[PDB]
Amino acid sequence: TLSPAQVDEYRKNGFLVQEHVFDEEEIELLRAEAAQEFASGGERVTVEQNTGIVRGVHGCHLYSEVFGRLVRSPRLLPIARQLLRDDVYVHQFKIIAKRAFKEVWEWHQDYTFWHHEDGMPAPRALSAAIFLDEVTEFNGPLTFVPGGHGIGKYSLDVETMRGLIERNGMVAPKGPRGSVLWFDANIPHSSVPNISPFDRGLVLITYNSVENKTDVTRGTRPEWLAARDFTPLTALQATSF
């Protein structure tokens, strides 16, 4: 679990980075497994329009043994329970390929899209972005308005951003391969394009509160984008095998 000093950097800033949570052997396992999901997700892999290039794949924690364990990991599941003062469930899971010379980019709040088109009641959620590769200034890093979480499609306009940014600034947190970037479901952020010539990968996991579940009433999206099964997640039945 996070120190109280880490919990309060997260409460203050709206995001937090822990470095080298995962080692190179575990990351490489995640990279190989992401390649299998790319090669055999069907409708679950997103492709570009006028190009044949793969940008992402979703839902893998429900079709892959490895990713099912990943989301129940002691380096993830506890921190998400702690931070959300609850038991939690995965709202969505994806693997993003930030391709060299990049996609859709506008400043947003995640909560907004979930609230309307899936049915989240409150911003009682977060995301853990696992860095499969080093995040630098030049490979399109997630970029935040720190403190920002406190709202002729769901993108924040320049007039509101103008004000939000004059007060708070902007940060593009960096980090080595194997870092985790935890960020609030109501922090405003944007993806810069990758002007480096090197592809970059991410695993993005959204933990939602159980008390805070979806209302199936409103939902439009298939299970691999928005989750139907709200069973609390627990650590793997504990074993010497």
Ligand X SMILES: O=C(O)CCC(=O)C(=O)O
Q: Answer yes or no whether residue 110 interacts with Fe ion by CB under 5 A.
A: yes
Q: What is the distance between the alpha carbons of residues 55 and 48, in angstroms, rounded to a whole number?
A: 7
204 binds ligand X (CB under 6 A): yes
Strands 180-184 and 142-144: unpaired
Quick one: which segment of 108-116, 117-125, 192-200, 216-224 binds its own copies (CB under 8 A)?
Answer: 192-200
Report the C-alpha gap between 152 and 57 in whole angstroms: 32
Contact window for its own copies (CB under 8 A) among 1-9, 88-96, 111-119, 137-145? 137-145
Closest separation in Å from C-beta 219 to ligand X:
17
Question: Residue 197 binds what, of its own copies, Fe ion, ligand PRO, none (CB under 5 to 8 Å, by partner type)?
Answer: its own copies
- Closest C-alpha to 190, from 148, 228, 224: 148
How many other C-beta atoms are found inside a 10 Å radius of the C-beta of residue 177?
A: 20
Q: 11 Cβ partners below 8 Å, 6+ apart?
A: none
Q: Pattern of binders to ligand X over 105-134, x per CB under 6 A? A: -----x----------------x-------
Q: Tell me how far, at minimum, the Cβ of 160 lies from its own copies, in Å.
A: 9
User: Is 114 among the residues that bind ligand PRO (CB under 6 A)?
Assistant: yes
Given the complex with ligand X, which of 132 and 142 has the nearer CB atom?
142
Range list of β-strands (E), 83-176: 88-98, 125-131, 142-144
For Cα atoms 84, 74, 172, give the angle at the middle one, nearest 5 degrees.
60
Binding residues (CB under 8 A) for its own copies: these are 100-101, 105-107, 137-138, 143, 158, 161-162, 165, 170, 172, 190, 192-193, 195-198
